[PDB]
Structures are given as C-alpha cells and as structure tokens.
C-alpha cells in the first residue's frame, strides 16, 4: 500500500495539512472520524494501521477484545472544506487483529468482498451504482424521549404550518409550496436555491462530479444527481454526499436529514439506486429481450425481486423506513417493475441507450448503510443470474389501485410493512448473501441483534402519541 | 323484553323522578354510546320495538344506504346516573338487525349473549363467571399533537418523577413521590388518590356494582378496584359502567382518567386481569384434583385458551398500545404458560384456590379490548379446549422474564405476538373456534379485521414516531 | 384470632366504616396500605388473610413465587382521621405461604420474634421502648436526579435563607430563629405552634398518649413526646406518629420529613430511643451499681456498645444518616455513655427513679425501619447480659474535643462514618442477631443486597455538587 | 492517582472504567491493559484507573515507586483475566478472591496509610508529607462529601 503513501504524503505537504481525519463506517451507517496531527505521521503508521477501541460500536467488539486497527485506504481522500484548520479525510477499513483478516463485520469490508465476488464468478467486471439521495432542510428540530412524553417537531419556513406565523417582529412573506408542492416552483417560493447550489459546489470540492439539482416534491426537500460509480466508490460518495449536505445546512444555520419520512402526509426521502453490470466495456444490461434490456439484466432483476422482502432489512434499515413505504407518495409498496412508472418498485428509465441501460430501484432509503445496501443488492442480483430467476411480468398500471382485493386475489409480493418482518424474511433466506463469505453468518447475526435492539424493540415499546388520540378514552 | 319487566321499570322511574332515559350501547371498538329520551315521551312500545338510530356512523357497522337500525333496550342492571344534573336512568341496549330480522351479528353485546348461550346449549356448563381487574390511571393533564410536522404527547401528574423539581401553586413542591414503579403501595401523602379511589367505589356501588379491594397500583398514577365476578355479559357490562364511573369521577374533581395499556414508558402498564370459572348445576367444574386444585375440565379449557392465544390477542389486546405493555419485566406476560403464584406467566393460578374459588387468571388482556368481544372470545377458546381435550402443556415455575432470546427460540416456547398486525394475522388464520354456532359470524370478523387495520395499524405503521428522530435523523 | 374479629367488626359498625385499610411495613420502613370495601368483609377473610403481590418490595419475593398473605393483627386499629370516607387502619403481618410460617423477611415479624426471644430466655418479661422522633416541616421541596444535574432545595419561611425574600407582594415579617436557634423562642418567631399542637391532638385521636411538644434546635424542626410502649407497640406507634405528622403537614399545605439531615450546618433529626427491661413489675434497669442503674442494665449497655458499629446498619439505615453523625450538633459520633451528656452516644437521663431507670440511645435516626432498629438493639443488649459485657468507663467530658489525637491515642470505638462500613461490620458480626432465628441469615442477606443497591451504590455513583466546587478546576 | 471522591463515581462497572485489578491484552475492563501493537521499542503497560483529579507529580512519582518495589521484591502480578470483567457477579467477586479497586477515597487513604513503606524508600515521600497529604484529603474531600447532604438522599429518605 506504499505506492499511494509517498504521493498522499506529498498531497498533504502542498495543501498545508495539519490533520488527517480517518473515517470509517460502523454497521449502523454512521460516519466516524479520528484526527491525527499530521507532523506525528510516519510512513510506517499507514502500513500498521490506526488502533482504536472497536468495542464502542454495537454489533462489533466486546470489551475483552477491544483493540482493533483502521487500515487507511488511500483513495478519494480530500481536504475537508469546513474544518477551520486544514484536514484531509481518508476512508479506512477495519482490520480484525484476532483473525488477521479484514473484519467480517466491517460494512465497507463486505462491500469490497462483494465487488470482488463478481470479479470471481465471471458474470461481470464492474458493478456500477448511482444514488439520488433525497433529503430535507429544516430550520429546527425538537425531540422529547421520556416516561411521560414522546415528542417531535421539525420546522422549516416553507411548511404549511407556518402560513400564519410571526417571524421577524410579525413579518410573514407568504409564497409557500403547498403540501407536496415543491416540484419545482421558482423562488421565492423555493427558498433553498442558493442552499442547494452551494452544496453542489462543495460536492465538487471533494471530488464528486454532479449533474442535476432540484427541489423535490415535499416541502423542504432536495436532491443532487451524482455520477455513477463502482459499488464501493458509489457508497463512498454517499458517505461524502451526506456529510456535505448536513454540514452546509449547518453553516447556514439549518439542519439536514436524509431520514426516510420526517413529515406525515408528505413525500419521504428516497435513495433511488441506479445499477448496471458491465464486462469488457460492453454494458451487460442492454439487450433486446425487453425495452432495451438484456435477459441477463432481467434475471438480475428476477433475483432482486425474489429476495426483496428480505433484502429490505439492509435497504430499509429503520422503522421510519416503513413509514415511507405507504402507497400514494411515489414510494413503492408492490414488488414489480415497469417502464416510466413511479408506483412500481423498480423503474426502467426512459433513455436506455446501450450505454445507459440500467434499473432504478426506488424502494431503498438513505437510512440504510450504503455499503450493506449496495452489497446486498448485488448478491441478490447475482443469485438471479445464477438461477436465471424469472422477474415476472411488467405491471404498467397505477399500482396504487384496487388495494385489498387485487393484491390478495391476483397480485405479487409486496414490501414488508415493518422492520421486524423484513428481518424475519432476511433470516429465513440468507444463502444468496452467504456465498463466498461476503456476508458471514456472524455478521448477519450481529446485524439482527443490533437492529432489533436499536430499531424494533424501542419502537415496539415506546408509546406513540396517536394511541392517545385513539385509546386514551378506551 | 317481557312486560313484567317493562312495567316495573316504568315505576322505578316515576318514584325516582326520572326525566331522561339514557339508552347506552357499545360499538365494536368498545366505546359506550348514548341517546337520551325525554321521559314521558317514552312508550311501552318503544321498549319492545326499540329505538331507531343511525348505524352508518360506526365503522365496521352499516352503510348509509341501509343506515337505519334499532336499539333494543335490556332492562337489567339499569341505574340512575349520578353525574347528570337532571335525573337520568341509564339502560343497556343491543342492536337489532332489521334487514335480517336477527339480533345484530356485529353487535358486540349481542355476540356476548350468543357466546354465553352457545355454552348452555352444548351442555358443558350452565354459567361462565368472569371477573375483571381494570387497572387505570388518573392524570392531571394530557396533551396531544398529530400533524404533518409534529407528533407529540404528554401526560402529567403531580406524582410523576418528572415533577420532582417543578414549581407549583407558588413554587411549592410537596415532595413525597413514589418512584417510577413505586406506587404499590405507599401510604399517603405519597398516595394522593386515596380519596379519589374511595370516591370511585362509592359511585361504583351507586350503579349496582360490588367492590372488594381498592389500592394504589405499581405505576405512578395507577389504581385498581376489584369488582364482583359476573356472568359473561354482566361482567362485560360492569366493565362499561366502571370505566364510565372512574372517567367521570376523575373528571368531577378536575382530572382525566384512562384505561389505556401503556401511557408511560418505563413504568407498569395497565392490565385487565381476567378471572374465569365455568360452573354447571352449581358445581365448579374448574376445581378438581388433576393439578393444584383444578380439574381436567379446567386444564383442557386452559389448553384451548393457550392454543388459540396468539389469535385471541386480537380481541383481548385490540390496540397497538396493548403491545407496548407486552414487554418483559413489568409483570406483563410475554410467555404463554401457566404457574401458581407467578406474575411472569400468561395465565396464573392464584394461591387460595378453594373449591368454590377454583379459577384461572389471564394476565395478558387489557382494557383497550371490547369486554364483550374479549369475554365472548375467551369463552369460545376455552370451550374448544374442552371439546378437543387440549393439553395445556407443562407449567413453567421460573422467572419467565429471565429467559434468553436463545432460551426462547431453542426451547420452543410459544410467546405472545408482538404487534396487533401479527395478532390479526394469527386470528385470521385460526378463526374456526369462534365461528362455532355462528357466534362470531364471518361478516363480523372481516369487519373487525377491517376496523382494526384502518383504526390502529395503518396509522401507527405510517405516522412517524419521535424516537425515529433520535435514531435516524442523523443519517 | 376470632376473639377480636367479632368485636372489631362491631367497632366498624358503630364508626360507620366503609374501608378497612390494611397496613404493613416493608424492609425499607415504608408504610403500605390496601383498602377493602367494608361490606365485602367476611369473618373468614380475617383468618385466611389478605392476598397481595409481595414481589413489588425489594428484598422480599421474586415474581415466580409472588403471592403472599397479610395477616391482620387486630390491635391498635383506629379510624383514619384524614380520609374523606370512613376508614379503619389495621396493622398486618406478612405470612409466608411457601413455608407456612410468619415471613422471616417481615420486619414486624422479626419484632415479634425478638420480644418473644426475651420471654423465652427468662432475662426479662417486657422490653419497653420510647421514641422521640425529631422531624422538619418545610413549605416546599424540589429535587433533580439526572445525567447533567443533581439538585435539592428545601424551603421554610423560617430559614435564614429567606430573611430578604419577598413573599406576599413583597412583605417579609422578620422574626426568624437563627441557624440552630429554634429552641425554644416564642411565636411569632415560632411559626409552628398551632401546627405542632394540632398534630398532638390527632396523635391522641389514633391512640397515642402524648407528653411534651416543642420546637427543636434546627430552624424548622419539631418533636412530640409519646409514651413508652413494648417493642412492637413502640414501633407500631412510630409508624403512626410519622403518618400523622406527614399528613397534617400536608393538610396545612406543607411537607414533613423525619429524614436524618436535610439542612447542612443545622441539627439533624434524632430517634432518641428510651429503653428499660422489666420483670415481674420490678424495673431491671434500676440498681445502685452506677447512678441509679443495675449492673444488669450496664451489661445490656455493654452489649449495645460492643456491637454498635454493626448495629448502626439497622439504626442508621440511610447514607443521609451519617451526614448527621458529625460532631458539634448534639449528634453522637463516639460510642460511650454519660449522665446528662448529649455529646455521648448513650445518655443516662436525670430522673432515674427505680421506676423510670433507662438509657437514651441518641445515635439512631428515623430513617431506620423502627421494627428492625428496636429489635436489633434488644438482641445486642441481650448478648450483653449473656456475656455480662463490660461497657467501659463513663466519659463525662465534652466529647467533641481533641479529635485527631485523643481518639487514636486513648479513645474507644466511634460510629461508622458511611453506611457501607456499617454493613461490613454488620456482616462481620451477626450471631447476636441470629440466635433463636430472630434474624434469619436469608433476611440478613436480603437486607444487605437491598441496602447496598438502594443507598450505597447510588450514593457512591451519583456525583455530588460539592465535587464541582472542589474538582471542576482540577 | 484517584485523589478525589469524584474519582470513585467513575470507578463503577460498565463505562470502560476499572473496578477489577488485573491485566489483559486488548481489555478495557481491566485495571491494566496491554496494548495490541507491543513492539520492542513500544512495549509498555497502560494503567486505566488513574484520573486527572490526581496531582500528576505525586501520581507519577507514586506509580514508579510501586513498580520499583515490584522489581526489588520480584512480585508476581498473578494471572491475567481475559474475560468481560464487568460481567462478574458479587458472588464471583468475593468467592473467587479477586482484588477490586477501593470504593471510596476514605478506604484508599486507609489502604495507603496502612501500606506506606514502598513510598518512603530513600525519603522520596517523607512521612511529614504523607501525614500532610492525609490531612489535606480528609479535610478537603472526604469530610465535606461525608457531611453535605446529597439530593438523592432526598429521593430515598425524604418520605421516611
């Protein structure tokens, strides 16, 4: 790994760097960092690694065996734009020093093991992923977790709830997108035009080529189109994207979130994921079996759809995730594919040149660990082509129709409604994850215990204010 | 309603100077509803034919095209309402289906008679005695908010640990507060509800109910009153009266009550500890010597209740809030076994267990249940047990909350369902023991299923929860 | 037990009783009650007992064996003066239904087993105890227990801290006893004259013959002299005394406490305990061996003093108890006896007629379970006479002298400084408690685990605001 | 090394703070910890029980005086414990004879005063100082913490 290290050390020298910020992702998806004063960096310190206390992350180490190592990966490093004093961020891998192998519970380690398992099978060479991370910019967020009171309230000057409020001595400027009305009125109704625009500039600042930037449907919502990248690199840029959006929100006095569903009755945030598999410069998704796609591509899709009910445990990894999977908000609840259809789980976009052929999986949200989600999808798509899995027939209707009857009488599987059912299904069908030990069963078992306690057990056990409207008078 | 009983009812009114008759009836959800008639405008015929009303207003009941239905008054356990300013007598009613010319198959109180009459017809028993303990809470304040950008609740009580620091009337704080989980049973002034609880049972008796015990309960503003056992309908009837009496007495003294299963995170939930015995020809069929004072008949009853338990939860634990209570360690059952003297078990064999008193106590039900449907269903599940001689398995005399997630799955130990959605699924996939003799007609079951998914599940599965903001907001 | 029951039922009939309030004391000393609607009482219900859930009291039952029985003792019952609707209070004993014997972890059961163990040995017939329960009447008490903040503040219109305050639109009436000045200025400096006086009336109302009532030394403090009674009956009236004082404080809008030390730099509350042993109408404490006392009495004292360091675990049962055992506040820290000396652990009062001969043990406080304290003292005094234990020589000096030197060079044992040392000493010397199974070792082990978790472990683990004055700047 | 009573609010199980006096590699439940790297140039121990309420001079001085006693008297540190030390019971503590940290500064000063010789070697800690240090810590920290009421006693005991 000492190729890079000279050069990286030379990149620090001419950017006048005082801190190297080692960043690495725990199971939950949280980005974590630890800064080393540059002068105290030797070349040897980057072969050995960075020690740390990996017992502090649920699902990783117990205290008896607490010591671990970060292995810096010297790719996509960049100068932190925000830190007062010069800092370079470097992604890192967690190395298990008790097995002297990459940590089978390191999410980014799994993501490398999956993009290698595709190299290793011969099916494909590269697996390209392309994320649209919808997010929200609120002014204020207030929470209460207690014996006698549960409470939240986001706030945004754009919200329908402020149409009558007094702001600056009682001045209210009107011009508010309605409920679900943000797509895409011009300013001053759009108050985030310069906020979204500066985000994009800083995204470019850290090595993210950008495409589109717009308001989204919900009241305070936004999106930036970022360029397809390979599986890890795609997930690497998701970590970056979120950091930038959250921090620029913060500089301008606001607060961002990529959480799936913050507002009732308004659109959730999606991680619209775009995939294609290529080999020897030929895009394997392109064909003529169906609307510009190959049968290979449809077998991939056959596998994603087949395991989807369990795949959701990694793509929809929060209980809040399922508050979004409700019909009528351009969020899929039914697992089928269709061209130009946003009620569908999967979407075939319009363009579909032999170069851009792909699917868009609309069901994941940004609550997921990007590493695990991308990884898990590819393991589900590869199982499909191995077993040449039938994806069923396209459904080109508005899927939010005939809910109760047509679903049970004729229709196909739909997304699990709670995180718990997603985990049940996951544990009941885990082989397509376990081949070639991409997802070792100890990791899979670590994630199940972590997610039940962090997400399910609190949600199943803290009362919800709506039960008080319903039941208080019971 | 025999005119021997209509006459004397009219005389009860003249000599108590009754000016309004408050016909009360229970929709599917458990809400007690009323419609008052100016006395004197009451016919003898209106107590036979019945009282018209608009049954399209009740979800799970009639459409607007066939909206008209009838209230059929039952002239038993009526009572003068103490609260109403002008004298009113409350009288129970069932819905009569005028399109099918049968007692309304979706009227819960009608179900509760059809469920108790299916037993006398089968010969297994004469009476089925039920005795509910409805733990409740008396709060000072409840504040709620459902909106696009804010979900919010707040109960408040003078006894709450959250008030240890508050400034009251002139910033004076009396101290003396039970801890979280400490209300059982400190004496006053730590116990603030001694005169409130005492005033409740005074009014319970006013309305034809007999009380034995009254204490503070384990959670901070919690309380309980023991009422006499009753037959299946009559017990469910007294539950409706009891709920009304505490709610209204909490109210006259400036407070607000609830029987909801889990209002406070981290403190005990409220249970409807339900006690059953089946008697026939004045012998108690639950007492025997097969086990700790219980008969083969009773143990087969318990096996039937335990077999259908996960599906039965849909009528006994009929809100999602029920399932915030069914968490280990608050004397709430998550494990479906029986044991004497055990409050970790789903069923409990009390210590006394004489002949006349032999009985079970089911600890998993709560007051979010419709008492008619709950009692009706509990009896229909026990009778399946006696018909099919169902073994309830083996008692577990351990601390059930100490068992691991390994010890749960590996040892194949049938636990309670975690959500109402799974409970309805479990019910819908096991509905036959209720459909015996059309006690729970299928139209009703589909209505009840449709009601609970739209009222409770789909809103709880779809409205954001403030803890997701602690967990996920930073993603 | 059916003698009483007819009559008791007849007493309820003519007092127009609607509730019978069964009261019983857990280990901690807390009085607990459970009310039965009178009409629902059968005679048989008083032989059998009252079932209850004895798993709700730490130190008693685990949930697997939760059911227990209360056995009403139909003595000293009385009409509750405060309850809106007529209530009779009845003390109760806890019956263990798994061993079909009185509950070896019932404090009042232990107190009966001890006053019987003295019958059984022949040393004495009656053991008379006489409590002075000092207490405080504050207007307001505010507390905060949290991650970032620990907080208390009592309030009383008499406190030095209110000399400058505005009360009723800015009116302050002056006339405040100073720090340590309450003994015994006349009103209006004494603001509790009618509060103390009405307490006494209600104490008589419940069958407690009273003697003296005065302000005490500390600013909001008080005391009522109540008549000697036998060991249980003495402890029975302590439960009563506290209930009345707390409830009359409450009716008049205040809040009482018998807690040992609520105010820093002011007097704590004592449970000045007066004991004598009698046999065949002759007071065994009276003699001529020392200042009107018998050698038998001095052997008793020899035993109390010998085991005192461990005896403190039952008489000084709260960590707050030891905040009082500080020199200079008429609280003993040194374990010796003396006539007319209030710096001493034990005091021989002035009167000492052959009828009133006794000791006054000043070191207990009202934080104790009265049952256990009285019980434990007698087991320590009886061990003394068995072994004819030497109590040492009297110390007639002001004991709050030559602290560091004279204590270590010449002086005798002093009280343990923390609750933990009191428990260590208790566990290291428990035989005088265990004879005749008065204190079974399972009870003794129950009390140790309960008291470490309720009292020691929280105190040793929640930071104290003074550490912030000392150490914040470390 | 733990020279305030506030030190002992930290020495409670489960916050990566030692209550058990043993060593182990990669173990943050232990009083002493052997780090993973442990090259030649880097071989070392890490003592996790000290805090910054300590006077660094006295703390370091005393740590060195206690280790040197170990080399002089060839003291065996016993056996390493490669368990989760915070999982051990109160039974497993006493029955298995496992030397835990002192719970209060008062017991720590008692333990020091009853074992002061390894510091007095070559007059490094003269006895006048030790008695001064003992007198200082009892009057500054112990006697005030043992004598000033604590708000939790108000939750526990106020209702008595």
Numbering used by the authors:
A (entry chain A), C (entry chain A): 8 to 481
B (entry chain B): 7 to 481
D (entry chain B): 322 to 481
What do the authors report?
The GS in H. pylori (Hpy GS) is a critical enzyme that is involved in processing the ammonia released by urease activity, and nitrogen metabolism. GS is an enzyme involved in the biosynthetic reaction producing glutamine from the condensation of glutamate and ammonia. This enzyme is present in all living organisms and is a large homo-oligomeric complex composed of eight, ten, or twelve subunits assembled into two face-to-face rings. Although the structural and sequence information of Hpy GS indicate its relationship with GS I-β due to the presence of a specific 25-amino acid residues (residues 155–179), the adenylation site (NLYDLP) found in similar homologs is replaced in Hpy GS (NLF407KLT), suggesting a lack of the adenylation regulatory mechanism in Hpy GS.
Although a hexamer of Hpy GSapo was present in each asymmetric unit of the crystal, it could be used to generate a dodecamer with 62 symmetry by stacking two hexameric rings face-to-face. In each subunit, N-terminal residues (Met1–Asn7 in subunit A, E, and F; Met1–Gln6 in subunit B, C, and D) and internal residues (Leu408–Gly418 in all subunits) were disordered. Six subunits in the asymmetric unit of Hpy GSapo were almost identical to each other with root-mean-square deviation (r.m.s.d.) values of 0.22–0.27 Å for 474 Cα atoms in residues 8–481. Superposition of Hpy GSapo and Hpy GSsub gave a r.m.s.d. value of 0.50 Å for 473 Cα residues (residues 9–481), and a r.m.s.d. value of 0.50 Å for 4,742 Cα atoms for dodecamer-dodecamer comparisons. The adenylation loops had higher r.m.s.d. values, which may be attributed to the disorder of the loop. These results indicated that Hpy GS does not undergo a large conformational change upon substrate binding. However, the Glu flap in both the Hpy GSapo and Hpy GSsub structures showed a similar closed conformation with little differences. However, the open form of GS was not found in Hpy GS, and the Glu flap was well ordered with a closed conformation in Hpy GSapo in the absence of substrates. This suggests that Hpy GS could exist in either the open or closed form regardless of the presence of substrates.
